[PDB]
Amino acid sequence: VQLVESGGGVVQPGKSVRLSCVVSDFPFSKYPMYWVRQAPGKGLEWVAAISGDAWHVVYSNSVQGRFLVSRDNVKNTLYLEMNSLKIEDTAVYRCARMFQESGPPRLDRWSGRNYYYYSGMDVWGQGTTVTVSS
Amino acid sequence: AEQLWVTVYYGVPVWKEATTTLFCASDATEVHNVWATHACVPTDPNPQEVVLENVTENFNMWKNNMVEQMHEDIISLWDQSLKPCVKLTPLCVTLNCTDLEGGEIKNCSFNITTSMRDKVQKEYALFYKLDVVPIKNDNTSYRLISCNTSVITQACPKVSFEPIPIHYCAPAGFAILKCNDKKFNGTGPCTNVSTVQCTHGIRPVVSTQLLLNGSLAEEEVVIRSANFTDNAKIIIVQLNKSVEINCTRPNNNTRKSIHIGPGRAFYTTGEIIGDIRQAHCNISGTKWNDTLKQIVVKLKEQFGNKTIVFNHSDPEIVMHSFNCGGEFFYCNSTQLFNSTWNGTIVLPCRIKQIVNMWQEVGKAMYAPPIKGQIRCSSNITGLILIRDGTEIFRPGGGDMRDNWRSELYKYKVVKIEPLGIAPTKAKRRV
Amino acid sequence: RNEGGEIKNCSFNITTSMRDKVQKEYALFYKLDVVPIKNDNTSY
Amino acid sequence: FLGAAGSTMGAASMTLTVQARLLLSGIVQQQNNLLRAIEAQQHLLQLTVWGIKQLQARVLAVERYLKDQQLLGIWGCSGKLICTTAVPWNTSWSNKSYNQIWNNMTWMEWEREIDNYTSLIYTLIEDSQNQQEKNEQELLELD
Amino acid sequence: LGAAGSTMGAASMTLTVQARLLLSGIVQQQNNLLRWLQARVLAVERYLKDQQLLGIWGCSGKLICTTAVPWNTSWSNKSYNQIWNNMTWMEWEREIDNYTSLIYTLIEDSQNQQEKNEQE
Amino acid sequence: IVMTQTPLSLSVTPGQPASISCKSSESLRQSNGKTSLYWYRQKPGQSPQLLVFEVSNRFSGVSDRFVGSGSGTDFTLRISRVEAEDVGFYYCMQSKDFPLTFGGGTKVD
Ligand SMILES: *[C@@H]1O[C@H](CO[C@@H]2O[C@@H](C)[C@@H](O)[C@@H](O)[C@@H]2O)[C@@H](O[C@@H]2O[C@H](CO)[C@@H](O[C@@H]3O[C@H](CO[C@H]4O[C@H](CO)[C@@H](O)[C@H](O)[C@@H]4O)[C@@H](O)[C@H](O[C@H]4O[C@H](CO)[C@@H](O[C@@H]5O[C@H](CO)[C@@H](O)[C@H](O)[C@H]5NC(C)=O)[C@H](O)[C@@H]4O[C@@H]4O[C@H](CO)[C@@H](O[C@@H]5O[C@H](CO)[C@H](O)[C@H](O)[C@H]5O)[C@H](O)[C@H]4NC(C)=O)[C@@H]3O)[C@H](O)[C@H]2NC(C)=O)[C@H](O)[C@H]1NC(C)=O
Ligand SMILES: *[C@@H]1O[C@H](CO[C@@H]2O[C@@H](C)[C@@H](O)[C@@H](O)[C@@H]2O)[C@@H](O[C@@H]2O[C@H](CO)[C@@H](O[C@@H]3O[C@H](CO[C@H]4O[C@H](CO[C@@H]5O[C@H](CO)[C@@H](O[C@@H]6O[C@H](CO)[C@H](O)[C@H](O)[C@H]6O)[C@H](O)[C@H]5NC(C)=O)[C@@H](O)[C@H](O)[C@@H]4O)[C@@H](O)[C@H](O[C@H]4O[C@H](CO)[C@@H](O)[C@H](O)[C@@H]4O)[C@@H]3O)[C@H](O)[C@H]2NC(C)=O)[C@H](O)[C@H]1NC(C)=O
Ligand SMILES: *[C@@H]1O[C@H](CO)[C@@H](O[C@@H]2O[C@H](CO)[C@@H](O[C@@H]3O[C@H](CO)[C@@H](O)[C@H](O)[C@@H]3O)[C@H](O)[C@H]2NC(C)=O)[C@H](O)[C@H]1NC(C)=O
Ligand SMILES: *[C@@H]1O[C@H](CO)[C@@H](O[C@@H]2O[C@H](CO)[C@@H](O)[C@H](O)[C@H]2NC(C)=O)[C@H](O)[C@H]1NC(C)=O
Ligand SMILES: *[C@@H]1O[C@H](CO)[C@@H](O[C@@H]2O[C@H](CO)[C@@H](O)[C@H](O)[C@H]2NC(C)=O)[C@H](O)[C@H]1NC(C)=O
Ligand SMILES: *[C@@H]1O[C@H](CO)[C@@H](O[C@@H]2O[C@H](CO)[C@@H](O)[C@H](O)[C@H]2NC(C)=O)[C@H](O)[C@H]1NC(C)=O
Ligand SMILES: *[C@@H]1O[C@H](CO)[C@@H](O[C@@H]2O[C@H](CO)[C@@H](O)[C@H](O)[C@H]2NC(C)=O)[C@H](O)[C@H]1NC(C)=O
Ligand SMILES: *[C@@H]1O[C@H](CO)[C@@H](O[C@@H]2O[C@H](CO)[C@@H](O)[C@H](O)[C@H]2NC(C)=O)[C@H](O)[C@H]1NC(C)=O
Ligand SMILES: *[C@@H]1O[C@H](CO)[C@@H](O[C@@H]2O[C@H](CO)[C@@H](O)[C@H](O)[C@H]2NC(C)=O)[C@H](O)[C@H]1NC(C)=O
Ligand SMILES: *[C@@H]1O[C@H](CO[C@@H]2O[C@H](CO)[C@@H](O)[C@H](O)[C@H]2NC(C)=O)[C@@H](O)[C@H](O)[C@H]1NC(C)=O
Ligand SMILES: *[C@@H]1O[C@H](CO[C@@H]2O[C@@H](C)[C@@H](O)[C@@H](O)[C@@H]2O)[C@@H](O)[C@H](O)[C@H]1NC(C)=O
Ligand SMILES: *[C@@H]1O[C@H](CO[C@@H]2O[C@@H](C)[C@@H](O)[C@@H](O)[C@@H]2O)[C@@H](O)[C@H](O)[C@H]1NC(C)=O
Ligand SMILES: *[C@@H]1O[C@H](CO)[C@@H](O)[C@H](O)[C@H]1NC(C)=O
Ligand SMILES: *[C@@H]1O[C@H](CO)[C@@H](O)[C@H](O)[C@H]1NC(C)=O
Ligand SMILES: *[C@@H]1O[C@H](CO)[C@@H](O)[C@H](O)[C@H]1NC(C)=O
Ligand SMILES: *[C@@H]1O[C@H](CO)[C@@H](O)[C@H](O)[C@H]1NC(C)=O
Ligand SMILES: *[C@@H]1O[C@H](CO)[C@@H](O)[C@H](O)[C@H]1NC(C)=O
Ligand SMILES: *[C@@H]1O[C@H](CO)[C@@H](O)[C@H](O)[C@H]1NC(C)=O
Ligand SMILES: *[C@@H]1O[C@H](CO)[C@@H](O)[C@H](O)[C@H]1NC(C)=O
Ligand SMILES: *[C@@H]1O[C@H](CO)[C@@H](O)[C@H](O)[C@H]1NC(C)=O
Ligand SMILES: *[C@@H]1O[C@H](CO)[C@@H](O)[C@H](O)[C@H]1NC(C)=O
Ligand SMILES: *[C@@H]1O[C@H](CO)[C@@H](O)[C@H](O)[C@H]1NC(C)=O
Numbered sequence A: 001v002q003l004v005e006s007g008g009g010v011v012q013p014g015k016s017v018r019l020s021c022v023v024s025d026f027p028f029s030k031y032p033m034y035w036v037r038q039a040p041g042k043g044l045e046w047v048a049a050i051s052g053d054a055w056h057v058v059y060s061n062s063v064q065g066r067f068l069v070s071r072d073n074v075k076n077t078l079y080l081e082m083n084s085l086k087i088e089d090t091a092v093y094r095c096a097r098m099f100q101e102s103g104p105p106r107l108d109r110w111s112g113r114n115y116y117y118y119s120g121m122d123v124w125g126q127g128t129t130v131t132v133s134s
Numbered sequence B: 001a002e003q004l005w006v007t008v009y010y011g012v013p014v015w016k017e018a019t020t021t022l023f024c025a026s027d028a029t030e031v032h033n034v035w036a037t038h039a040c041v042p043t044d045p046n047p048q049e050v051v052l053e054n055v056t057e058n059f060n061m062w063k064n065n066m067v068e069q070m071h072e073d074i075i076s077l078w079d080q081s082l083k084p085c086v087k088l089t090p091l092c093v094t095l096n097c098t099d100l101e102g103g104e105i106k107n108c109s110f111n112i113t114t115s116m117r118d119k120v121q122k123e124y125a126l127f128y129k130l131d132v133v134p135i136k137n138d139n140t141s142y143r144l145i146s147c148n149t150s151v152i153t154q155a156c157p158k159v160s161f162e163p164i165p166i167h168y169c170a171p172a173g174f175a176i177l178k179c180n181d182k183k184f185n186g187t188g189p190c191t192n193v194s195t196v197q198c199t200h201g202i203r204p205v206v207s208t209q210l211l212l213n214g215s216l217a218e219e220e221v222v223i224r225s226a227n228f229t230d231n232a233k234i235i236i237v238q239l240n241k242s243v244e245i246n247c248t249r250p251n252n253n254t255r256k257s258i259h260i261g262p263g264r265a266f267y268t269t270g271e272i273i274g275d276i277r278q279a280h281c282n283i284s285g286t287k288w289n290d291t292l293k294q295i296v297v298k299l300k301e302q303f304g305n306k307t308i309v310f311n312h313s314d315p316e317i318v319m320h321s322f323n324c325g326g327e328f329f330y331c332n333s334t335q336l337f338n339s340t341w342n343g344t345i346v347l348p349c350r351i352k353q354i355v356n357m358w359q360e361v362g363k364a365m366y367a368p369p370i371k372g373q374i375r376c377s378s379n380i381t382g383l384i385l386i387r388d389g390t391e392i393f394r395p396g397g398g399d400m401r402d403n404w405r406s407e408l409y410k411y412k413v414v415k416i417e418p419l420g421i422a423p424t425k426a427k428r429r430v
Numbered sequence C: 001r002n003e004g005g006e007i008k009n010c011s012f013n014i015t016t017s018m019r020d021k022v023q024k025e026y027a028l029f030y031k032l033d034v035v036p037i038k039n040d041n042t043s044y
Numbered sequence D: 001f002l003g004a005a006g007s008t009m010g011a012a013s014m015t016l017t018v019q020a021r022l023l024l025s026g027i028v029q030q031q032n033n034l035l036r037a038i039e040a041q042q043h044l045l046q047l048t049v050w051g052i053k054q055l056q057a058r059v060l061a062v063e064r065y066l067k068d069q070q071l072l073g074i075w076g077c078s079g080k081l082i083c084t085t086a087v088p089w090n091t092s093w094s095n096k097s098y099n100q101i102w103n104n105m106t107w108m109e110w111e112r113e114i115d116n117y118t119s120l121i122y123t124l125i126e127d128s129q130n131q132q133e134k135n136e137q138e139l140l141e142l143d
Numbered sequence E: 001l002g003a004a005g006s007t008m009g010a011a012s013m014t015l016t017v018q019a020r021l022l023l024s025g026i027v028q029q030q031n032n033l034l035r036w037l038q039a040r041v042l043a044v045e046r047y048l049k050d051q052q053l054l055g056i057w058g059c060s061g062k063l064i065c066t067t068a069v070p071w072n073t074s075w076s077n078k079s080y081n082q083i084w085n086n087m088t089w090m091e092w093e094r095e096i097d098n099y100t101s102l103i104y105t106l107i108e109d110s111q112n113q114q115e116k117n118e119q120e
Numbered sequence F: 001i002v003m004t005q006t007p008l009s010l011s012v013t014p015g016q017p018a019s020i021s022c023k024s025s026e027s028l029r030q031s032n033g034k035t036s037l038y039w040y041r042q043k044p045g046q047s048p049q050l051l052v053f054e055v056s057n058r059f060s061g062v063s064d065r066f067v068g069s070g071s072g073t074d075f076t077l078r079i080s081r082v083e084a085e086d087v088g089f090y091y092c093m094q095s096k097d098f099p100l101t102f103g104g105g106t107k108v109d
Helices: B065-071 B074-080 B285-299 D009-015 D025-034 D049-074 D098-102 D108-114 D118-130 D132-139 E011-020 E038-056 E089-096 E100-113
Strands: A009-011 A021-023 A033-038 A045-050 A057-059 A068-072 A077-081 A091-098 A121-124 A129-132 B005-010 B106-108 B125-127 B132-134 B142-144 B152-154 B174-179 B193-196 B210-212 B235-249 B254-261 B264-271 B280-284 B320-323 B328-331 B344-351 B364-366 B374-387 B392-394 B411-415 B419-424 D082-088 F003-006 F018-024 F037-042 F049-052 F066-070 F075-079 F089-094
Touching: A033 A121, A045 A068, A045 A077, A077 A091, A091 A129, A121 F049, B005 D049, B005 D118, B065 B074, B065 B411, B074 D049, B125 B264, B210 B320, B235 B285, B280 B285, B280 B328, B285 B344, B419 D049, D009 D098, D025 D049, D025 E038, D049 D118, D049 E038, D082 D118, D118 D132, E038 E100, F003 F089, F018 F037, F018 F089, F049 F066, F075 F089
Parallel strands: A009 A129, B152 B364
Antiparallel strands: A021 A077, A033 A045, A033 A091, A045 A057, A068 A077, A091 A121, B005 B419, B005 D082, B106 B125, B132 B142, B174 B193, B174 B411, B210 B374, B235 B280, B235 B374, B254 B264, B280 B344, B320 B328, B328 B344, B374 B392, F003 F018, F018 F075, F037 F049, F037 F089, F066 F075
């Protein structure tokens, strides 16, 4: 369905904004989400991922610790907050849904540790753009 | 509101789909039969069948593991009963054959038998044209057919070959579901799914282009296949109104013995007594004609124009094949595939004594000769047909696995998992 | 025809499964598996 | 014994007063006659293909019986049929309401509703109650 | 098997010895695995038949337990001290062997399938 | 892990079959019984669209001439009778573990 973002634009280094991706119709708490970054004239870079219950969060190593993601399954929103901005972060951000459905976490019997399954993407939002310069 | 508490119920009526390993149940003695294998759990004539109320359960008759399980087992039963017997390795020598329709049975004279080393033994023998091959380098002089093919191994003569119904029972805690829709396509859902513990009788009959002793579809004539508009998926014709056949070996066929194994005697045709009369079969010409029209009506509900044509389908794969009293018949069934739809039918039969496998590579069993005259009768209830894409129908090849798909087409295997929980208002007082 | 190695291809009579008549052959044989036998000229 | 597999969960507890339709009784009346010693009146006469399969058949009759007794044995619910626990139901497992589970539902569909969540309930009985109550019982014997 | 000649009120003191040695006896096979277990597996199944059957009979763990089932004298009307202080156990089994499976349904139903409808 | 591909530029005209392969350093076979390699396409100036999710199956709105195969390390996407609107890029995307990477995107003119 409908899948866009908001809050894009252009800021300075050292700044901090937060985007807002909003989904339309599918049950949002059922699915995990992602973030991808296409640099202009380059390929794609994976950014982040959230579990369906907003419990599991995995970041890329380059943007590790700087950014922030979150969910609101009632408001059907999707946030990518960012901190300590650098000029090479200037690219196209895209909000994207997992292709398959995901289940609840698994809890293997032999060790009391849950498991959140993660598979790839089908619906890319057209996405905003953030530029970091002077 | 009431804070709900967890309650464990043992004995909930649930299941899933599963795979398993099965075991026989014979309903009955010296235990020397290849299939029956009276070292087997005896049955129970209890009627155990439990009917359900509200079940919609998809089956399949091709992706059901119960039929792939037999084909890895009935070749194991038939090869355990073949290993301890004598090999026929010194028989593959130079032959010298002559004839006494034309000359079919062959007075052959090979002349070594190494019971010892120094003194090899000349020998008298009687063979068949379905077992010997010509050699191109001299005058008339033969050899067995499958020398350079595989190890020809004689079956021991004190064995048996009769089909005896083998009730597959699931092991305990499992169950077998069974549908009871008369109009069942073979692969859809069902409505009345009954539950048994152990299936019905399955005669382990081996044959090709037909089925013998079968089962009975009821009230009409059922045709099943998966991909109709593909030529690949073979249609299977089950019947009511069990069509009877007689087949016979009108000869006497005394057998002699030849000592080749030191303690292991080789058996061959000693001499025939009487008149050389070809083996054949008899079919009632009336019932066969009445039966085929009943098929075409169901054919014209899946091929309802471009009218149905019968045409007949290498000596092995083209011929009709079956066993009769531990004796294997190859019968020319050309006559039964002549008509289209807009007294006593005699079919000729040939006899081969070197059978092949199901995969037909790596082993070759040799039948021993049987004294006396052989009579067998059986109900023809199953027909194998293939389309080509008016519509023409050939009988088909020899994929023996397809036999039991006409006999397991109501059965799946489940796993009773009787433990499960549900919430309610009642808490255990600690 | 194109060290000690594959120089020798060989030949021998054998009658394995036909059990009627022997027949000579040709193979390819390395070293480390053959022995020049006694009282004979180039026999392995 | 599967006679109410199309019935509803609010109604299948009525006929479950029979001992899960005498569930385990069908095993003992089987293994009294599975242990017909005609197997010992032959020593099978050989080792056969069937006796290989019967041996692999009796083991699963042994194991899968034990895995259902042990789990009932550990849950403080040994040998009973309908026992309650102390574990509070979490609505995150199923947001179905009360009557829809009982009055308006089969069983096998309800399996696929919580077959994901089933394993979490297994740990959340033992370590929440049956590990837990035994210590608190033993404290009440300290006095 | 020591009290096999005792009366039924007397042989009850050796019930513990019979139960213990049913399973595996004394342990044979002193770890000599140097150089073919169906009989070993059956003995467990004989054991687990009975413990489950005492579990359905509400009587796991015990050796002697009561009931709510009254006797039906058509089984055997032989009265109390006619047998109890007069007869061994081999003979009491040869009075009730025809009625054996009939006793088992009644103990199943009217003692625990009954008392399942008293739980509430 | 590392996963690149080849060839970068295939400037073609319609009417012929060809294929694009993506080469894997770490072998991909998850314990579910499947190999998490996802092939899809962007157009220039557009967010991408899924061609095939698995190397076996396809997606809705996909012509039948889009076939893919491969081993645990070899991976191949074949386009029979390459269509006129096959412009833009073709990214090979894997989903073994994190961080899940991409290819460069093979340009097809
Ligand atoms: C228990 O756990 C298991 C998983 O764990 C398992 O068990 C554990 C114990 C572990 O062992 C673990 O390892 C095990 O795996 C859970 O199983 C999961 O179940 C879900 C279902 O609940 C499965 O999800 C589905 O998967 C398919 C693909 O999967 C296939 O392959 C797998 C394996 O290969 C098979 O098992 C499976 O059966 C399939 O064959 C996926 O495609 C499905 O998504 C589509 O359908 C839904 C339903 O419509 C869509 O959701 C809708 O979206 C719209 C849009 O916003 C909303 O408006 C609707 O509200 C919403 N919902 C509904 C009900 O409609 C979903 O978006 C998607 O829809 C398709 O979307 C595309 C893109 O938009 C669209 O394509 C478009 O087409 C048009 C026209 O052609 C244009 O061309 C467009 O351009 C084009 O993009 C297409 O048309 C849409 N189709 C439809 C019909 O809408 C579905 O999610 C999941 O696979 C399965 N497994 C796993 C591993 O997760 C199980 O759920 C758990 N149990 C419980 C109780 O939770
Ligand atoms: C019924 O089941 C429920 C669900 O069960 C769940 O699923 C099952 C299948 C099974 O797997 C269960 O194990 C599993 O729990 C039960 O619900 C769970 O309840 C427990 C309580 O015991 C919850 O645990 C709490 O977890 C919280 C989150 O911890 C995560 O996050 C920490 C950091 O938090 C993050 O902070 C950033 C700050 O920026 C947030 O970002 C903002 O987000 C905004 C909204 O989107 C906005 O976008 C902003 O832009 C953005 O900046 C971010 O959102 C936030 N994360 C989350 C998830 O909100 C990490 O430090 C931590 O490692 C973990 O990653 C904790 O905060 C919380 O601690 C607090 O609460 C305590 C008690 O309330 C309090 O004492 C503490 O002092 C502290 O304040 C808990 O630890 C668990 O999350 C629940 N599960 C789920 C899925 O939510 C339920 O309990 C059960 N019913 C019953 C009766 O038991
Ligand atoms: C071919 O099929 C027909 C019908 O399907 C078979 O006829 C039926 O055969 C069974 C046993 O062979 C008969 O049961 C027996 O009936 C006699 C009647 O006197 C009874 O005395 C026996 O105790 C036993 O119950 C059954 O009645 C019979 N059906 C009819 C209508 O007569 C036939 O046996 C099959 N033949 C072959 C070679 O497959
Ligand atoms: C095969 O058997 C025939 C029949 O005995 C052999 O032919 C005979 O050879 C002798 C020797 O000269 C003659 O005296 C006979 O008249 C022949 N009889 C016939 C019918 O031809 C023959 O030698 C045997 N061997 C082979 C290899 O054919
Ligand atoms: C078949 O060929 C065999 C030859 O092997 C014939 O056997 C000979 O029979 C005569 C008597 O009729 C004997 O004196 C010979 O010693 C036999 N030769 C053998 C056994 O090698 C036999 O007669 C032929 N015909 C039939 C019908 O068997
Ligand atoms: C068994 O097959 C026979 C042969 O077709 C069936 O009898 C005929 O069925 C057709 C189709 O219903 C009718 O048109 C004919 O009138 C029937 N009789 C005759 C003499 O041809 C029969 O219905 C099938 N079922 C049973 C239970 O006998
Ligand atoms: C039954 O078989 C026929 C083949 O004779 C199938 O029809 C075609 O199958 C090919 C195989 O991929 C497809 O490419 C065609 O599009 C099919 N044609 C039509 C008109 O459908 C048919 O799909 C098969 N049906 C089933 C249920 O397997
Ligand atoms: C096949 O052989 C059987 C013999 O088993 C024949 O059955 C006999 O048929 C006659 C009718 O001509 C009856 O009077 C006899 O009672 C039957 N006897 C037995 C034992 O069945 C049968 O006729 C033969 N032919 C066909 C076509 O089946
Ligand atoms: C089955 O028998 C028929 C009998 O007509 C065979 O058909 C013809 O047989 C004559 C021999 O007199 C041959 O000359 C013809 O060439 C045969 N016709 C055809 C079309 O081949 C038929 O060959 C037999 N088939 C089998 C498999 O035994
Ligand atoms: C589903 O099947 C049952 C089966 O009932 C049996 O039908 C055979 C028919 O020959 C009869 O001989 C048996 O006596 C019947 N009973 C038993 C206990 O085997 C039917 O009764 C249902 O009506 C069927 N359901 C539908 C919808 O047809
Ligand atoms: C096998 O026999 C060998 C003897 O064979 C003869 O001697 C050698 C030197 C060669 O000339 C060979 O070609 C001859 O036929 C033994 O040398 C050898 O140890 C034996 N191997 C065993 C006993 O394993
Ligand atoms: C339950 O039975 C339903 C029929 O009645 C419906 O029940 C309530 C819960 C409402 O949904 C209302 O629409 C009807 O009166 C079936 O429709 C339904 O499939 C059944 N199964 C469920 C809910 O799991
Ligand atoms: C060899 O015997 C066959 C059989 O009669 C015959 O046809 C052939 O002519 C014989 N060979 C010679 C050279 O006569
Ligand atoms: C049998 O009927 C079902 C519907 O009841 C249908 O889906 C199925 O395809 C049919 N079988 C065949 C082989 O067509
Ligand atoms: C078969 O039929 C033929 C003639 O139809 C007859 O001569 C022969 O005796 C019959 N044989 C049997 C076994 O019925
Ligand atoms: C042949 O096709 C026509 C076209 O629908 C149909 O009316 C007719 O019934 C078909 N013939 C048969 C025998 O079904
Ligand atoms: C049967 O098949 C053969 C195969 O060539 C064909 O020539 C013949 O026309 C078909 N029909 C009849 C009636 O023989
Ligand atoms: C082996 O043969 C060669 C050449 O044929 C000859 O020179 C040599 O003397 C022979 N050796 C013997 C016979 O030992
Ligand atoms: C080996 O074969 C050659 C062939 O020309 C022959 O000359 C030589 O004598 C043979 N040697 C032996 C030992 O057989
Ligand atoms: C066995 O017999 C003797 C004498 O008849 C008796 O005193 C003894 O008590 C008997 N054993 C039991 C267990 O009663
Ligand atoms: C048990 O007692 C009842 C009366 O309550 C009687 O009808 C029945 O016959 C008795 N049981 C037997 C097996 O005789
Ligand atoms: C016990 O039974 C025997 C059996 O004959 C009898 O002789 C004896 O008197 C009985 N004793 C008592 C105390 O009833």
